[PDB]
Design a protein around this ligand. Structure first.
Ligand SMILES: Cc1cc(CCCOc2c(C)cc(-c3noc(C(F)(F)F)n3)cc2C)on1
Ligand SMILES: Cc1cc(CCCOc2c(C)cc(-c3noc(C(F)(F)F)n3)cc2C)on1
Lengths: 273, 40, 236, 255, 273, 236, 59, 40, 40
């Protein structure tokens, strides 16, 4: 594959470097159209810039926390974090979000990796071997109310049990209701004067609960859970302007009031180097 | 070799190797030839 | 039992590794694919589409005006604008090119820099775009700039002039992050003759500049960008 | 002597001519087409009104002043009250369509100005209030009138800083979307053909706007000495390959 | 393959053992050219002295330290070593350095191995299971500022998570910007009267950050990290004089003032055995 | 699930093991190879190139002078220089040969020892190089040295004399580290006749000695060298 | 010994995974199959059978 | 057998088996024959 | 590939792919044709 062909002097009626950008087209002008060039080859395929590679690595998409402690006397297990849940979405942590939002529609399979790390902030005689249970609770499935509900039987909901300090791995097929995931949605759930706007009403993927199977020890243990996402078998459509201003909310395109200028200001002239 | 039954569990697809920028660079109705006046 | 020996690395989680993993939803049948126009296969595809450059940084806040390069009537020799070519910073940092470029560590190839005139039809002018390859300073007068890769643009019927910044380098790859040994050079524009306005016409005419990559382009070693951040996890 | 500049577009009983165009854009190089069996889901036989809805509808003219910021319409919304096309929109549960957008704005060889005409698929707007505030239905369904980016914020509405495309992205990169410029010294019209772009075969035409059209002045207006400091901008749109499905009662929408 | 051929008496005009080293050539004189020899075979291939083997084993290239402790009240996480970073280079530890510097240019792929060991210098009731995160931060990527930045999301930077006491393994392709790595560079980053000299301006490979994902325990834990490098698919050019004097700095060829004689001095005559 | 049994060694990190490992940079495209002269494939290649021997250790500090072997006019029978043949120590330790040899534990083969005369053209001399194989002492007079492998060098037009030290040993390999059972012998040089200077010529003429390996050479069992060290990690 | 590298997920118990496992009752011979009418293969089979709707919730 | 997709992840190359010391030992312009006077 | 000797230790059977709802939907004695009066 050639990168540049050999091109010498020129004196034509054919002016390639003269176009009209108001047509909306980016004419494919090459160096060899405005200067004398030598032959050179690519030696490059562009494999690393294929969308399958761009979204093909694990990125953290959520961090949450649960703890192993005496549940005796706790009225709201959820609030106490005896078990906690994550209302699934990929727009909570911005790094991956900006990437995905480089396109309008996106379709792919996902490979998740859940990392759980332990912590004993105050006096403990040892570090316990806790086993975590991560259960996917689809929309319509009964949500857990107590850390040891009947819901954790997970007869039909899928779920994994892994040691804290260890990692959990599994993959999920493209579960979109449409033919692709919407990164943006200029619409509502119905023609109503007050309902929510945005992909907020579209990406309703349920949530996944986390808990620690073991009963409590004398000391309290703090388990922090991190979910990582890796896309595979990627397909993307309609590229769009990259995000410039910082995010403020999951799903909305909203940006903070009184935000700092994102375009750098010149320390001088427009003639400055 | 694939150890699992479902398609979703297989690894990365490997380079698409299509690469056609024209649908974004030249989405014009009447073809424009390089070197020929853009507006005739 | 097949005798095995676990190697160092066992148990590690490499965010970049590509292996198989069991499916949590066995026998699930994803929704059929339908045709959706505008499919993107490679980022190298889209950076060939040019976007506007906020060449006129000069403002105290982001404004439409930062995209307008002012041109003044009856000036001779003078310089219209200038900038180094660290496509991963400066004016370029917010453009589509710069934005994508910053997702990678190395770049190589030729750049496409265009200028579209917006002054009245009955006006005229001849400017000169120059690309100064690394090794010397940014040109300080037309004579100096003219000694390097340049283009004499005659304004007229065809509104835009497309000047190429031919990949001119020793080492075959440069860093997207501004690094000195890896500098790309300088871009400057001057008055070849001068802007002339017609009668009953007064004020300022502006130029719009665009930047895009040639099929020449190569990008490699993916990395996180300095163009996005957060202090706390977002909430619904 | 056929030119890029001269063009005629005929849809239904409506024809458009322009003697100073700059070619025309076909979003993602795809001409609009009807829904093929292989992609359909909804089992209802669709309705194809053809020439009664696939014609040119001209919106109310906007006034471009030295201070204008830009405007933003949304489809199919902008045509919700246009002849039979509109009626069908509310009477059917579902519907799909593409359009041919024609933006007009003439001046003289003495004037100067450059409008950016672009189509943005799924242009989900942001709320000026920030945080996690929504943008109420009525505010993204301005209808024929469209949204004027130089007007002031209003409770429940979207932010309107042209600089951030009303969505947190920089104006300059709007070019990655199918666009075209109206540079008074070259142009006087912009034309963009939009094919149906969505992640579903057919969709609700009241609760979801597939794309929004924006006309944004980049290089400000400039008139010759002692002339009226304004130019009118007109937007004419025509649906094409329009299909409606699931007919019934007729939606009653917010306001 | 013969090591020595059979060669007997000699009395010629052909004097092989008489040469002129000022030509700059090392004439291939053999024993059989100056003495009567018998036939002998090699039984040797020289596999262990192939550059692919010489640089083909793991060598420690860097040692650093991070610690798991209460971050409350710490103003500079970096200084406190809540997380630490390594400005990547192969000339910090001399053993491998001398080897690599046996040649001028060198090209190869690398296999890294990161070993993390734990230490509790003062009172602890147990040894915690900490997980380390090693993240490659290429030039241009945002550097971590706090041990729990957004930067650790590592959406695009590659990174590994492994248990302390365990080892991390992965390989990296030849990432040189040129066709080979420079072990030496008689130049500067630009024609400037004060800028740095040497490969210091060439080998700008970014750095990799290390941190300990777990929150803090009651006691403080000291994790020491060691990075090992092994080259594979080796290619070397322009051999050079081996280094004689000790090193003083990463990248510079500088050697200490008032350094000891490296050539041994005879305990006697030049006639001494 | 395939039944397996992990063997002893699992989890170990052998710095010398050669296995596959996942790539941290998937789909990265390294820079193309270009031609670079002077490619080295084997260290056995370069040790065949001879370098100068600092035979004249005698000095208090490293000096150019340590490479100059003095030769005195009108001396008869006398010895010019001498040294054992522990190529991994003594004079040899800093030479290219010695330096590389020290990266391995075992060596075997024949050595190439050369002597280049630098005295005036109009001078003359006949020296004798002798190699005394292990078993006896280093020769104490010419007669004794002459009884073993030697070369009578006539100084003249061809400046250099190349004497080979033919691999003479029972066991087929010796240690690079000085070990007695593994001694290589002794090298000595004497006056065959004597150095004669021309008129109006006064002083000292010097000899330059070189050392290099023959294609005979073999080296094995790689190891760290005693020729480099540090007390603390270097810093930028 | 065949060199291996354990991947993340090792040791996990995915309630949904479908793998082989040793039989606790080797050489056991299950009871022969006999014909039983009304075999169901898919739930999509039975939901095609209609049942009564308690449309009159009112009670 | 290679388990990974990239070249970099494969093990050691195995002996080059070229071995030509002459480019360092005899980089002279006019070939010099062993036994023939080095300077003629 | 099956690692164990017994049938019980093998993995899931994979879709039956028979699917005949008629034994539950139309368990009538005299065949009833769609469109023809159910009671003739
Ligand atoms: C945009 C966009 C894309 C997606 C994909 C969400 C995938 O959602 C899941 C997740 C995160 C986990 C499981 C899951 N299955 O099993 C388990 C577990 F039990 F191991 F956690 N989790 C199933 C679905 C459909 O969500 N929003
Ligand atoms: C001379 C010379 C040769 C080299 C090679 C440096 C290779 O640099 C790296 C390193 C050390 C690690 C990674 C890396 N990728 O992933 C990870 C981690 F996250 F597992 F650490 N580290 C990537 C590059 C380009 O540097 N100087």
């Amino acid at each position: 594959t050639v990168a540049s062909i050999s091109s010498g002097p020129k004196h034509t009626q054919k002016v390639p470097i003269l176009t009209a950008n108001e047509t909306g087209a980016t004419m494919p002008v090459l160096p060899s159209d405005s200067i004398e060039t030598r032959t050179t080859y690519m030696h490059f395929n562009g494999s690393e810039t294929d969308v399958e590679c761009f979204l093909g690595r694990a990125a953290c998409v959520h961090v949450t926390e649960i703890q192993n402690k005496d549940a005796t006397g706790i009225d709201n297990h959820r609030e106490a974090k005896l078990f906690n849940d994550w209302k699934i979405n990929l727009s909570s942590l911005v790094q991956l979000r900006k990437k995905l939002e480089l396109f309008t529609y996106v379709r792919f399979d996902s490979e998740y990796t859940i990392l759980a790390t332990a912590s004993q902030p105050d006096s403990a005689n040892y570090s316990s071997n806790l086993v975590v249970q991560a259960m996917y609770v689809p929309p319509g499935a009964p949500n857990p109310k107590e850390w040891d509900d009947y819901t954790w039987q997970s007869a039909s909901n899928p779920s994994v049990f892994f040691k804290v300090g260890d990692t959990s791995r599994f993959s999920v097929p493209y579960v979109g209701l449409a033919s692709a995931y919407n990164c943006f949605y200029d619409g509502y759930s119905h023609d109503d004067a007050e309902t929510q706007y945005g992909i907020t009403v579209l990406n309703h993927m349920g949530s996944m609960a986390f808990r620690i199977v073991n009963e409590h020890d004398e000391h309290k243990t703090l388990v922090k859970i991190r979910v990582y996402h890796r896309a595979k078998h990627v397909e993307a459509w309609i590229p769009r302007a990259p995000r410039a201003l910082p995010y403020t909310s999951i799903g909305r395109t909203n940006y903070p009031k009184n935000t700092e200028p994102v375009i750098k200001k010149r320390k001088g002239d427009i003639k400055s180097y | 070799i694939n150890y699992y039954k479902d398609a979703a569990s297989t690894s990365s697809a490997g380079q698409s190797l299509s690469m056609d920028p024209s649908k974004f660079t030249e989405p014009v109705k009447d073809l424009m030839l390089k070197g020929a006046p853009a507006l005739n | 039992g097949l005798p095995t020996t676990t190697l160092p690395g066992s148990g590690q989680f490499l965010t970049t590794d590509d292996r198989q993993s069991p499916s949590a939803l066995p026998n699930y049948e994803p929704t059929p694919r339908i045709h959706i126009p505008g499919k993107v296969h490679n980022l190298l595809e889209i950076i060939q589409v040019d976007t506007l450059i906020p060449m006129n940084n000069t403002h105290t806040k982001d404004e439409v005006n930062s995209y307008l390069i002012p041109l003044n009537a009856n000036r001779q020799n003078e310089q219209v604008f200038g900038t180094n070519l660290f496509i991963g910073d400066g004016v370029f940092k917010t453009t589509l090119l710069g934005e994508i470029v910053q997702y990678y560590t190395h770049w190589s190839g030729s750049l496409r820099f265009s200028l579209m005139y917006t002054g009245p039809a009955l006006s005229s002018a001849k400017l000169i775009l120059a690309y100064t390859p690394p090794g010397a300073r940014g040109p300080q007068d037309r004579r100096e700039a003219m000694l390097g890769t340049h283009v004499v643009w005659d304004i007229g019927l065809q509104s835009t002039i497309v000047m190429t910044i031919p990949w001119t380098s020793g080492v075959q790859f440069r860093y997207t992050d501004p690094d000195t040994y890896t500098s790309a050079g300088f871009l400057s524009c001057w008055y070849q003759t001068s802007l002339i306005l017609p009668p009953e016409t007064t004020g300022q005419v502006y130029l719009l500049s665009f930047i895009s990559a040639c099929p020449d382009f190569k990008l490699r070693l993916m990395k996180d960008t300095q163009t996005i951040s957060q202090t706390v996890a977002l909430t619904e | 002597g056929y030119s890029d500049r001269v063009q005629q577009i005929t849809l239904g009983n409506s024809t458009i001519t322009t003697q100073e165009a700059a070619n025309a854009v076909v979003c993602y190089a795809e001409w609009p087409e009807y829904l093929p069996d292989v992609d359909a889901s909804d089992v209802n036989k669709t309705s194809k009104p053809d020439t009664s809805v696939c014609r040119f509808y001209t919106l109310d003219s906007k006034t471009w002043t030295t201070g204008s910021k830009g405007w933003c319409w949304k489809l199919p919304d902008a045509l919700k009250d246009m002849g039979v096309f509109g009626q069908n929109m509310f009477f059917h549960s579902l519907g799909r369509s593409g359009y041919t957008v024609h933006v007009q704005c003439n001046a003289t060889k003495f004037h100067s100005g450059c409008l950016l005409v672009v189509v943005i698929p799924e242009h989900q707007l942001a709320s000026h209030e920030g945080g996690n505030v929504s943008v109420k239905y009525t505010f993204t369904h301005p209808g024929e009138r469209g949204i004027d980016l130089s007007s002031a914020n209003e409770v429940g509405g979207p932010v309107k800083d042209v600089l951030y495309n009303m969505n947190g992205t920089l104006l300059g990169n709007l070019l990655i979307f199918p666009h075209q410029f109206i540079n008074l010294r070259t142009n006087n019209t912009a034309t963009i053909v939009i094919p149906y772009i969505n992640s579903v075969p057919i969709d609700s035409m009241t609760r979801h706007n597939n794309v929004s059209l924006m006309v944004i002045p980049i290089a400000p207006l400039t008139v010759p000495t002692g002339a009226t400091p304004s130019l009118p901008i007109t937007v004419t749109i025509a649906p094409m390959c329009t299909e409606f499905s699931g007919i019934r009662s007729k939606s009653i929408v917010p306001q």
